[PDB]
Design a protein around this ligand. Structure first.
Ligand SMILES: [Cl-]
Ligand SMILES: [Cl-]
Length: 269
Protein backbone atom coordinates (compact mmCIF):
# COMPACT_ATOMS: atom_id res chain seq x y z
CA UNK A 1 0.00 0.00 0.00
CA UNK A 2 1.67 3.16 1.25
CA UNK A 3 5.34 3.68 0.45
CA UNK A 4 7.65 3.29 3.47
CA UNK A 5 8.04 7.10 3.58
CA UNK A 6 4.27 7.59 3.63
CA UNK A 7 4.01 5.07 6.48
CA UNK A 8 6.69 6.96 8.36
CA UNK A 9 4.67 10.17 7.95
CA UNK A 10 1.86 8.58 9.99
CA UNK A 11 4.08 9.40 12.99
CA UNK A 12 4.07 13.19 12.42
CA UNK A 13 3.05 15.10 15.58
CA UNK A 14 4.25 15.98 19.06
CA UNK A 15 4.80 12.89 21.20
CA UNK A 16 5.11 13.55 24.92
CA UNK A 17 5.96 11.09 27.64
CA UNK A 18 9.13 9.46 28.86
CA UNK A 19 12.05 7.18 28.13
CA UNK A 20 12.29 4.54 30.88
CA UNK A 21 15.15 2.07 31.42
CA UNK A 22 14.25 -1.22 33.00
CA UNK A 23 16.36 -4.14 34.18
CA UNK A 24 15.85 -7.59 32.57
CA UNK A 25 13.67 -8.45 35.64
CA UNK A 26 11.41 -5.40 35.09
CA UNK A 27 12.80 -3.00 37.67
CA UNK A 28 12.60 0.67 36.73
CA UNK A 29 16.11 2.08 36.82
CA UNK A 30 15.92 5.43 35.10
CA UNK A 31 13.18 7.56 33.61
CA UNK A 32 13.40 10.89 31.80
CA UNK A 33 10.49 12.97 30.62
CA UNK A 34 10.42 13.60 26.88
CA UNK A 35 8.90 15.65 24.06
CA UNK A 36 9.55 14.40 20.51
CA UNK A 37 8.41 16.57 17.68
CA UNK A 38 8.27 15.07 14.21
CA UNK A 39 7.40 17.66 11.66
CA UNK A 40 7.29 17.52 7.88
CA UNK A 41 8.93 20.19 5.75
CA UNK A 42 9.04 20.94 2.05
CA UNK A 43 5.80 19.16 1.14
CA UNK A 44 6.78 16.37 3.57
CA UNK A 45 9.91 15.57 1.64
CA UNK A 46 12.04 16.21 4.78
CA UNK A 47 11.11 15.21 8.34
CA UNK A 48 12.70 17.16 11.21
CA UNK A 49 12.96 15.39 14.54
CA UNK A 50 13.38 17.45 17.74
CA UNK A 51 13.82 15.29 20.85
CA UNK A 52 13.85 17.18 24.17
CA UNK A 53 14.47 15.20 27.39
CA UNK A 54 14.53 16.57 30.94
CA UNK A 55 18.08 17.50 32.01
CA UNK A 56 19.54 16.78 28.55
CA UNK A 57 20.43 18.79 25.44
CA UNK A 58 17.95 18.71 22.58
CA UNK A 59 18.58 16.26 19.74
CA UNK A 60 17.71 17.50 16.25
CA UNK A 61 17.81 15.18 13.21
CA UNK A 62 16.50 15.48 9.69
CA UNK A 63 15.51 12.60 7.41
CA UNK A 64 14.99 12.61 3.66
CA UNK A 65 14.44 8.83 3.41
CA UNK A 66 13.85 5.73 5.45
CA UNK A 67 15.58 2.44 4.86
CA UNK A 68 18.43 0.59 6.38
CA UNK A 69 17.36 -1.01 9.60
CA UNK A 70 13.84 0.44 9.62
CA UNK A 71 10.58 -1.01 8.37
CA UNK A 72 7.07 0.49 8.76
CA UNK A 73 3.49 -0.68 8.72
CA UNK A 74 0.72 1.41 7.20
CA UNK A 75 -0.47 2.74 10.52
CA UNK A 76 3.01 4.12 11.24
CA UNK A 77 4.09 1.28 13.53
CA UNK A 78 7.70 0.26 12.96
CA UNK A 79 10.80 -1.48 14.03
CA UNK A 80 14.38 -0.28 14.10
CA UNK A 81 17.61 -2.24 14.61
CA UNK A 82 20.63 -3.75 13.03
CA UNK A 83 20.62 -5.28 9.57
CA UNK A 84 23.52 -7.77 10.15
CA UNK A 85 24.59 -9.38 13.42
CA UNK A 86 28.08 -10.64 14.23
CA UNK A 87 31.05 -10.68 16.67
CA UNK A 88 30.78 -7.02 17.77
CA UNK A 89 27.18 -6.36 16.79
CA UNK A 90 25.01 -7.20 19.78
CA UNK A 91 21.42 -8.36 19.45
CA UNK A 92 18.64 -5.88 20.23
CA UNK A 93 16.42 -3.36 18.49
CA UNK A 94 13.13 -1.49 18.84
CA UNK A 95 9.50 -2.47 18.36
CA UNK A 96 7.28 0.61 18.08
CA UNK A 97 3.47 0.40 18.19
CA UNK A 98 1.21 3.26 17.10
CA UNK A 99 -2.46 3.33 18.20
CA UNK A 100 -4.68 6.42 18.08
CA UNK A 101 -3.12 9.03 20.48
CA UNK A 102 -0.41 6.68 21.79
CA UNK A 103 2.86 5.10 20.87
CA UNK A 104 4.48 2.35 22.87
CA UNK A 105 8.04 1.73 21.85
CA UNK A 106 10.12 -1.03 23.36
CA UNK A 107 13.88 -1.37 23.01
CA UNK A 108 15.73 -4.57 23.95
CA UNK A 109 19.46 -4.57 24.56
CA UNK A 110 21.65 -7.69 24.74
CA UNK A 111 25.18 -8.00 26.04
CA UNK A 112 28.26 -9.55 24.48
CA UNK A 113 27.40 -13.01 25.83
CA UNK A 114 24.04 -12.84 24.12
CA UNK A 115 21.96 -12.24 27.28
CA UNK A 116 19.29 -9.57 27.79
CA UNK A 117 20.99 -6.60 29.52
CA UNK A 118 18.22 -4.02 29.65
CA UNK A 119 15.10 -2.56 28.12
CA UNK A 120 13.86 0.89 27.28
CA UNK A 121 10.11 1.54 27.36
CA UNK A 122 9.03 4.70 25.65
CA UNK A 123 5.39 5.58 26.46
CA UNK A 124 4.17 8.49 24.39
CA UNK A 125 0.89 10.36 24.00
CA UNK A 126 0.05 13.10 21.57
CA UNK A 127 0.49 16.53 23.12
CA UNK A 128 -2.88 17.69 24.48
CA UNK A 129 -4.34 14.18 24.62
CA UNK A 130 -4.67 11.96 27.67
CA UNK A 131 -1.65 10.04 29.00
CA UNK A 132 -3.88 7.00 28.73
CA UNK A 133 -1.55 4.74 30.65
CA UNK A 134 -2.60 1.07 30.56
CA UNK A 135 -2.23 -1.11 33.72
CA UNK A 136 0.93 -3.01 34.57
CA UNK A 137 0.58 -6.27 32.60
CA UNK A 138 -0.38 -9.35 34.66
CA UNK A 139 -0.55 -13.02 33.60
CA UNK A 140 -4.22 -12.98 34.42
CA UNK A 141 -4.75 -10.29 31.76
CA UNK A 142 -3.63 -12.79 29.13
CA UNK A 143 -5.29 -16.04 30.14
CA UNK A 144 -7.85 -17.24 27.64
CA UNK A 145 -7.89 -17.32 23.87
CA UNK A 146 -6.95 -14.71 21.30
CA UNK A 147 -7.59 -14.75 17.56
CA UNK A 148 -6.42 -12.47 14.81
CA UNK A 149 -4.29 -11.80 11.77
CA UNK A 150 -0.60 -11.00 11.16
CA UNK A 151 1.09 -9.06 8.39
CA UNK A 152 4.73 -9.86 7.54
CA UNK A 153 6.68 -7.34 5.57
CA UNK A 154 10.14 -7.77 4.02
CA UNK A 155 13.26 -5.74 3.55
CA UNK A 156 13.27 -6.23 -0.18
CA UNK A 157 9.78 -4.77 -0.05
CA UNK A 158 8.43 -7.85 -1.92
CA UNK A 159 4.70 -8.15 -1.30
CA UNK A 160 3.49 -8.63 2.28
CA UNK A 161 2.23 -11.95 3.58
CA UNK A 162 -0.94 -12.36 5.67
CA UNK A 163 -1.54 -15.12 8.20
CA UNK A 164 -4.15 -16.19 10.75
CA UNK A 165 -3.11 -16.30 14.39
CA UNK A 166 -4.38 -18.05 17.47
CA UNK A 167 -2.96 -17.74 20.99
CA UNK A 168 -4.25 -19.83 23.90
CA UNK A 169 -2.84 -19.26 27.39
CA UNK A 170 -3.95 -21.27 30.38
CA UNK A 171 -2.64 -22.20 33.81
CA UNK A 172 -2.18 -25.93 34.32
CA UNK A 173 -2.65 -27.53 37.70
CA UNK A 174 0.66 -27.43 38.57
CA UNK A 175 0.27 -23.63 38.22
CA UNK A 176 2.56 -23.60 35.23
CA UNK A 177 1.59 -21.73 32.11
CA UNK A 178 0.51 -23.60 28.95
CA UNK A 179 0.79 -21.50 25.77
CA UNK A 180 -0.29 -22.65 22.31
CA UNK A 181 0.43 -20.27 19.50
CA UNK A 182 -0.59 -20.69 15.84
CA UNK A 183 0.86 -18.62 13.10
CA UNK A 184 -0.34 -19.60 9.64
CA UNK A 185 0.36 -23.32 9.26
CA UNK A 186 2.67 -23.44 12.33
CA UNK A 187 1.55 -24.24 15.86
CA UNK A 188 3.89 -24.32 18.91
CA UNK A 189 2.56 -25.50 22.28
CA UNK A 190 4.92 -25.22 25.29
CA UNK A 191 4.72 -25.14 29.06
CA UNK A 192 6.37 -22.34 31.04
CA UNK A 193 7.11 -21.52 34.67
CA UNK A 194 6.06 -18.18 36.16
CA UNK A 195 8.38 -16.33 38.52
CA UNK A 196 7.00 -12.88 39.35
CA UNK A 197 7.04 -10.69 36.26
CA UNK A 198 8.98 -13.32 34.25
CA UNK A 199 7.58 -16.30 32.40
CA UNK A 200 10.28 -18.80 31.49
CA UNK A 201 10.14 -21.18 28.50
CA UNK A 202 13.25 -23.37 28.61
CA UNK A 203 12.19 -26.97 27.71
CA UNK A 204 11.44 -26.88 23.98
CA UNK A 205 14.12 -26.04 21.37
CA UNK A 206 11.44 -24.09 19.42
CA UNK A 207 10.74 -21.79 22.41
CA UNK A 208 13.78 -20.79 24.47
CA UNK A 209 12.64 -17.43 25.83
CA UNK A 210 11.82 -15.31 28.81
CA UNK A 211 8.72 -13.13 28.73
CA UNK A 212 8.78 -10.05 30.88
CA UNK A 213 5.56 -8.32 31.86
CA UNK A 214 5.82 -4.55 31.99
CA UNK A 215 3.96 -1.32 32.55
CA UNK A 216 1.38 0.06 30.10
CA UNK A 217 0.23 -3.46 29.09
CA UNK A 218 3.66 -4.12 27.53
CA UNK A 219 5.56 -7.35 27.28
CA UNK A 220 9.00 -8.24 26.03
CA UNK A 221 9.92 -11.75 24.78
CA UNK A 222 13.68 -12.37 24.70
CA UNK A 223 15.91 -15.28 23.63
CA UNK A 224 17.46 -16.92 26.72
CA UNK A 225 20.79 -16.72 24.87
CA UNK A 226 21.69 -15.48 21.48
CA UNK A 227 23.48 -18.47 19.88
CA UNK A 228 25.65 -18.64 16.77
CA UNK A 229 23.93 -20.14 13.71
CA UNK A 230 20.43 -19.94 15.08
CA UNK A 231 17.61 -17.71 13.84
CA UNK A 232 16.65 -14.89 16.20
CA UNK A 233 13.37 -13.16 16.96
CA UNK A 234 12.99 -9.88 18.88
CA UNK A 235 9.37 -9.70 20.15
CA UNK A 236 7.23 -7.30 22.10
CA UNK A 237 3.51 -7.06 22.79
CA UNK A 238 1.06 -4.44 23.88
CA UNK A 239 -2.31 -5.12 25.52
CA UNK A 240 -3.97 -2.02 24.09
CA UNK A 241 -7.39 -2.77 25.61
CA UNK A 242 -8.54 -5.70 27.80
CA UNK A 243 -9.66 -7.52 24.57
CA UNK A 244 -7.14 -6.15 22.06
CA UNK A 245 -3.43 -7.02 21.83
CA UNK A 246 -0.74 -6.49 19.30
CA UNK A 247 2.52 -8.40 19.02
CA UNK A 248 5.51 -7.40 16.88
CA UNK A 249 8.36 -9.72 15.79
CA UNK A 250 11.62 -8.62 14.10
CA UNK A 251 13.05 -11.77 12.49
CA UNK A 252 16.67 -12.70 11.74
CA UNK A 253 17.90 -15.74 9.75
CA UNK A 254 20.62 -18.08 11.12
CA UNK A 255 23.26 -16.07 9.24
CA UNK A 256 22.31 -13.08 11.46
CA UNK A 257 20.69 -11.15 8.59
CA UNK A 258 17.46 -9.27 9.30
CA UNK A 259 14.81 -10.73 7.00
CA UNK A 260 11.35 -9.51 8.02
CA UNK A 261 8.98 -7.80 10.46
CA UNK A 262 5.60 -9.06 11.58
CA UNK A 263 2.65 -7.30 13.26
CA UNK A 264 -0.05 -9.41 14.87
CA UNK A 265 -3.38 -7.90 15.93
CA UNK A 266 -5.55 -10.21 17.99
CA UNK A 267 -8.76 -10.02 19.96
CA UNK A 268 -9.86 -11.88 23.06
CA UNK A 269 -12.34 -14.69 22.47
CL1 LIG B 1 5.02 22.31 3.01
CL1 LIG C 1 6.02 -10.21 24.08
Amino acid sequence: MKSQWECFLQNLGVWEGSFSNFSPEGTLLNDTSSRLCLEGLNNNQTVRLTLSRSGKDDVIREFRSVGGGLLFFENGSFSEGLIQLGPFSEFGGELAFVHENRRLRLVQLFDRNGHLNGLTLIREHLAGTPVAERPLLQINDLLGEWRGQAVTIYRDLRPPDIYSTTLKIQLDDAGRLMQSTSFGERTITSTATIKGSIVLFDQDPEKQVQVLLLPDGASATSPLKVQLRQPLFLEAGWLIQSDLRQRMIRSYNDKGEWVSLTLVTEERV
